[PDB]
Structure formats: C-alpha cells, structure tokens
C-alpha cells in the first residue's frame, strides 16, 4: 500500500506541495508523491530543485498507472509499483530535475 509510504502525501494540493517543497533547508531532489489534482487514477511526483538561474523551485511530474499494472512517468520506463518507481528515480535523474533524495518535511 501506497498509503504506507512516508513519501506518499495523498490528497494534498499542488499549491500545498509547493509550499512544503519551497523550504530553504530542502536540498535538490526533496520530494513527495501525491494524488493528481485533475486526473483520476494518476499521481504526481513533486520535486524540489535549485540553480542560480531560478533559485529554489518545484517541478511536478505526472505518474500514470495502467489497469494493466504498470506505473510510470514515461511509458518507455515502467515499474510494477510506485515504490519501485521511487527507488529507480532515487538512483537515476533521467528526465527529472534531480534524482530523488529525501522525503519532504511538513
Ligand atoms: C502545470 C505543471 O506543473 N505541469 C507539469 C505536468 C503536470 C503535473 C501535475 C499536474 C497536476 C497537479 O498539479 O496535480 C494534475 O495532475 O492535475 C498537471 C496539470 O495541471 O494538469 C500537469 C509539467 O509540465 N511538468 C514538467 C516537469 C519538468 C520537465 C518538463 N515536463 C515534460 C517531461 C519531460 C520528460 C520527463 C521525464 C522524466 C523522467 C524520465 C524521462 C522523462 C517528464 C516530463 C513536464 O511534464
């Protein structure tokens, strides 16, 4: 269960995820997974980033889940679970702003 994961914030809004991720103490890759605000069945991976150009900022990546069982950000790279997906992105930046590092503080 996703509801078991400490990085799963469930039904929080996009604005709220930005409020939590825009904390000065968050290093790049601080993240949380929440429900998509407008796509039934989808989730969103909200991630903190930082560069001199934009300072501290947030990126939101939609996560799709097929009834066929696969979870993914890009259909080319699928996982059997949301947990496996988070594990993979904690080791690979790929198309993300930074590899996932630590769960977002509230
Ligand atoms: C309004 C907004 O924040 N849009 C997000 C997408 C998005 C997320 C959540 C909701 C949203 C919510 O906020 O709840 C909702 O679902 O309703 C909505 C929305 O408003 O509809 C839309 C966006 O454009 N993110 C960027 C994020 C930065 C990269 C650029 N890109 C395209 C992309 C390219 C590559 C990859 C990639 C990643 C890993 C590996 C390989 C490739 C992923 C995305 C994105 O999707």
PDB file of N, CA, C and O and ligand atoms in Angstrom, residues 14 18 34-39 42-44 59-62 73-74 89 93-96, ligand 1:
ATOM      1  N   UNK A  14      -1.547  20.862  -5.188  1.00  0.00           N
ATOM      2  CA  UNK A  14      -0.358  21.276  -5.897  1.00  0.00           C
ATOM      3  C   UNK A  14       0.297  22.546  -5.162  1.00  0.00           C
ATOM      4  O   UNK A  14       1.492  22.612  -4.948  1.00  0.00           O
ATOM      5  N   UNK A  18       3.934  22.793  -3.190  1.00  0.00           N
ATOM      6  CA  UNK A  18       4.927  23.833  -3.432  1.00  0.00           C
ATOM      7  C   UNK A  18       5.247  24.541  -2.143  1.00  0.00           C
ATOM      8  O   UNK A  18       6.402  24.813  -1.890  1.00  0.00           O
ATOM      9  N   UNK A  34       1.896  12.648  -4.478  1.00  0.00           N
ATOM     10  CA  UNK A  34       0.524  12.977  -4.069  1.00  0.00           C
ATOM     11  C   UNK A  34      -0.449  12.560  -5.165  1.00  0.00           C
ATOM     12  O   UNK A  34      -0.065  12.087  -6.231  1.00  0.00           O
ATOM     13  N   UNK A  35      -1.739  12.733  -4.909  1.00  0.00           N
ATOM     14  CA  UNK A  35      -2.716  12.432  -5.942  1.00  0.00           C
ATOM     15  C   UNK A  35      -2.690  13.580  -6.955  1.00  0.00           C
ATOM     16  O   UNK A  35      -2.413  14.748  -6.628  1.00  0.00           O
ATOM     17  N   UNK A  36      -2.951  13.223  -8.203  1.00  0.00           N
ATOM     18  CA  UNK A  36      -3.047  14.205  -9.286  1.00  0.00           C
ATOM     19  C   UNK A  36      -4.305  15.054  -8.955  1.00  0.00           C
ATOM     20  O   UNK A  36      -5.271  14.475  -8.472  1.00  0.00           O
ATOM     21  N   UNK A  37      -4.281  16.363  -9.168  1.00  0.00           N
ATOM     22  CA  UNK A  37      -5.466  17.163  -8.872  1.00  0.00           C
ATOM     23  C   UNK A  37      -6.593  16.973  -9.902  1.00  0.00           C
ATOM     24  O   UNK A  37      -7.801  17.005  -9.547  1.00  0.00           O
ATOM     25  N   UNK A  38      -6.226  16.700 -11.148  1.00  0.00           N
ATOM     26  CA  UNK A  38      -7.246  16.591 -12.177  1.00  0.00           C
ATOM     27  C   UNK A  38      -7.323  15.335 -12.993  1.00  0.00           C
ATOM     28  O   UNK A  38      -8.183  15.253 -13.852  1.00  0.00           O
ATOM     29  N   UNK A  39      -6.506  14.330 -12.694  1.00  0.00           N
ATOM     30  CA  UNK A  39      -6.569  13.083 -13.454  1.00  0.00           C
ATOM     31  C   UNK A  39      -6.871  11.932 -12.560  1.00  0.00           C
ATOM     32  O   UNK A  39      -6.056  11.530 -11.719  1.00  0.00           O
ATOM     33  N   UNK A  42      -4.304   8.994 -11.497  1.00  0.00           N
ATOM     34  CA  UNK A  42      -2.912   9.407 -11.655  1.00  0.00           C
ATOM     35  C   UNK A  42      -2.373  10.033 -10.391  1.00  0.00           C
ATOM     36  O   UNK A  42      -3.128  10.469  -9.508  1.00  0.00           O
ATOM     37  N   UNK A  43      -1.046  10.074 -10.288  1.00  0.00           N
ATOM     38  CA  UNK A  43      -0.369  10.663  -9.133  1.00  0.00           C
ATOM     39  C   UNK A  43       0.547  11.696  -9.633  1.00  0.00           C
ATOM     40  O   UNK A  43       0.676  11.869 -10.838  1.00  0.00           O
ATOM     41  N   UNK A  44       1.175  12.438  -8.736  1.00  0.00           N
ATOM     42  CA  UNK A  44       2.132  13.453  -9.136  1.00  0.00           C
ATOM     43  C   UNK A  44       3.287  13.363  -8.198  1.00  0.00           C
ATOM     44  O   UNK A  44       3.145  13.181  -6.992  1.00  0.00           O
ATOM     45  N   UNK A  59       9.150  21.149  -9.423  1.00  0.00           N
ATOM     46  CA  UNK A  59       8.722  20.550 -10.680  1.00  0.00           C
ATOM     47  C   UNK A  59       7.771  19.500 -10.338  1.00  0.00           C
ATOM     48  O   UNK A  59       7.935  18.805  -9.318  1.00  0.00           O
ATOM     49  N   UNK A  60       6.723  19.361 -11.142  1.00  0.00           N
ATOM     50  CA  UNK A  60       5.700  18.344 -10.914  1.00  0.00           C
ATOM     51  C   UNK A  60       5.643  17.400 -12.091  1.00  0.00           C
ATOM     52  O   UNK A  60       5.451  17.824 -13.176  1.00  0.00           O
ATOM     53  N   UNK A  61       5.773  16.109 -11.825  1.00  0.00           N
ATOM     54  CA  UNK A  61       5.739  15.072 -12.852  1.00  0.00           C
ATOM     55  C   UNK A  61       4.559  14.159 -12.647  1.00  0.00           C
ATOM     56  O   UNK A  61       4.365  13.533 -11.576  1.00  0.00           O
ATOM     57  N   UNK A  62       3.727  14.045 -13.669  1.00  0.00           N
ATOM     58  CA  UNK A  62       2.577  13.169 -13.577  1.00  0.00           C
ATOM     59  C   UNK A  62       3.009  11.676 -13.680  1.00  0.00           C
ATOM     60  O   UNK A  62       3.889  11.297 -14.468  1.00  0.00           O
ATOM     61  N   UNK A  73       6.386   7.475 -15.419  1.00  0.00           N
ATOM     62  CA  UNK A  73       6.369   8.893 -15.739  1.00  0.00           C
ATOM     63  C   UNK A  73       6.443   8.858 -17.321  1.00  0.00           C
ATOM     64  O   UNK A  73       5.637   9.525 -17.985  1.00  0.00           O
ATOM     65  N   UNK A  74       7.411   8.134 -17.884  1.00  0.00           N
ATOM     66  CA  UNK A  74       7.450   7.955 -19.339  1.00  0.00           C
ATOM     67  C   UNK A  74       7.088   6.466 -19.611  1.00  0.00           C
ATOM     68  O   UNK A  74       7.587   5.570 -18.936  1.00  0.00           O
ATOM     69  N   UNK A  89      14.153   6.248  -9.467  1.00  0.00           N
ATOM     70  CA  UNK A  89      14.441   7.682  -9.614  1.00  0.00           C
ATOM     71  C   UNK A  89      15.309   8.286  -8.520  1.00  0.00           C
ATOM     72  O   UNK A  89      15.665   9.431  -8.603  1.00  0.00           O
ATOM     73  N   UNK A  93      18.656  10.342 -12.489  1.00  0.00           N
ATOM     74  CA  UNK A  93      17.941  11.608 -12.707  1.00  0.00           C
ATOM     75  C   UNK A  93      17.033  11.436 -14.022  1.00  0.00           C
ATOM     76  O   UNK A  93      15.850  11.706 -14.013  1.00  0.00           O
ATOM     77  N   UNK A  94      17.640  10.883 -15.078  1.00  0.00           N
ATOM     78  CA  UNK A  94      16.968  10.685 -16.366  1.00  0.00           C
ATOM     79  C   UNK A  94      16.360  12.056 -16.839  1.00  0.00           C
ATOM     80  O   UNK A  94      17.123  13.005 -17.032  1.00  0.00           O
ATOM     81  N   UNK A  95      15.040  12.126 -16.997  1.00  0.00           N
ATOM     82  CA  UNK A  95      14.378  13.356 -17.417  1.00  0.00           C
ATOM     83  C   UNK A  95      13.951  14.256 -16.253  1.00  0.00           C
ATOM     84  O   UNK A  95      13.375  15.333 -16.483  1.00  0.00           O
ATOM     85  N   UNK A  96      14.241  13.842 -15.014  1.00  0.00           N
ATOM     86  CA  UNK A  96      13.891  14.643 -13.807  1.00  0.00           C
ATOM     87  C   UNK A  96      14.867  15.792 -13.528  1.00  0.00           C
ATOM     88  O   UNK A  96      16.046  15.788 -13.952  1.00  0.00           O
TER      89      UNK A  96
HETATM   90  C1  LIG B   1       1.492  22.809 -14.749  1.00  0.00           C
HETATM   91  C2  LIG B   1       2.635  21.820 -14.468  1.00  0.00           C
HETATM   92  O1  LIG B   1       3.302  21.857 -13.443  1.00  0.00           O
HETATM   93  N1  LIG B   1       2.749  20.882 -15.400  1.00  0.00           N
HETATM   94  C3  LIG B   1       3.624  19.738 -15.193  1.00  0.00           C
HETATM   95  C4  LIG B   1       2.899  18.453 -15.571  1.00  0.00           C
HETATM   96  C5  LIG B   1       1.737  18.333 -14.638  1.00  0.00           C
HETATM   97  C6  LIG B   1       1.925  17.773 -13.359  1.00  0.00           C
HETATM   98  C7  LIG B   1       0.838  17.714 -12.486  1.00  0.00           C
HETATM   99  C8  LIG B   1      -0.386  18.288 -12.870  1.00  0.00           C
HETATM  100  C9  LIG B   1      -1.478  18.181 -11.843  1.00  0.00           C
HETATM  101  C10 LIG B   1      -1.256  18.519 -10.380  1.00  0.00           C
HETATM  102  O2  LIG B   1      -0.518  19.561 -10.088  1.00  0.00           O
HETATM  103  O3  LIG B   1      -1.931  17.905  -9.642  1.00  0.00           O
HETATM  104  C11 LIG B   1      -2.747  17.366 -12.088  1.00  0.00           C
HETATM  105  O4  LIG B   1      -2.434  16.131 -12.405  1.00  0.00           O
HETATM  106  O5  LIG B   1      -3.853  17.787 -12.083  1.00  0.00           O
HETATM  107  C12 LIG B   1      -0.574  18.926 -14.162  1.00  0.00           C
HETATM  108  C13 LIG B   1      -1.847  19.645 -14.607  1.00  0.00           C
HETATM  109  O6  LIG B   1      -2.149  20.894 -14.122  1.00  0.00           O
HETATM  110  O7  LIG B   1      -2.579  19.114 -15.367  1.00  0.00           O
HETATM  111  C14 LIG B   1       0.499  18.890 -15.086  1.00  0.00           C
HETATM  112  C15 LIG B   1       4.846  19.864 -16.116  1.00  0.00           C
HETATM  113  O8  LIG B   1       4.798  20.423 -17.232  1.00  0.00           O
HETATM  114  N2  LIG B   1       5.945  19.276 -15.568  1.00  0.00           N
HETATM  115  C16 LIG B   1       7.158  19.243 -16.338  1.00  0.00           C
HETATM  116  C17 LIG B   1       8.290  18.775 -15.432  1.00  0.00           C
HETATM  117  C18 LIG B   1       9.670  19.183 -15.924  1.00  0.00           C
HETATM  118  C19 LIG B   1      10.011  18.591 -17.267  1.00  0.00           C
HETATM  119  C20 LIG B   1       9.142  19.173 -18.366  1.00  0.00           C
HETATM  120  N3  LIG B   1       7.959  18.301 -18.456  1.00  0.00           N
HETATM  121  C21 LIG B   1       7.862  17.270 -19.550  1.00  0.00           C
HETATM  122  C22 LIG B   1       8.558  15.963 -19.175  1.00  0.00           C
HETATM  123  C23 LIG B   1       9.693  15.574 -19.940  1.00  0.00           C
HETATM  124  C24 LIG B   1      10.442  14.454 -19.548  1.00  0.00           C
HETATM  125  C25 LIG B   1      10.051  13.761 -18.388  1.00  0.00           C
HETATM  126  C26 LIG B   1      10.882  12.597 -17.959  1.00  0.00           C
HETATM  127  C27 LIG B   1      11.026  12.300 -16.566  1.00  0.00           C
HETATM  128  C28 LIG B   1      11.717  11.125 -16.172  1.00  0.00           C
HETATM  129  C29 LIG B   1      12.281  10.296 -17.150  1.00  0.00           C
HETATM  130  C30 LIG B   1      12.188  10.579 -18.513  1.00  0.00           C
HETATM  131  C31 LIG B   1      11.485  11.749 -18.955  1.00  0.00           C
HETATM  132  C32 LIG B   1       8.923  14.087 -17.583  1.00  0.00           C
HETATM  133  C33 LIG B   1       8.162  15.210 -18.003  1.00  0.00           C
HETATM  134  C34 LIG B   1       6.956  18.247 -17.501  1.00  0.00           C
HETATM  135  O9  LIG B   1       5.974  17.476 -17.511  1.00  0.00           O
END
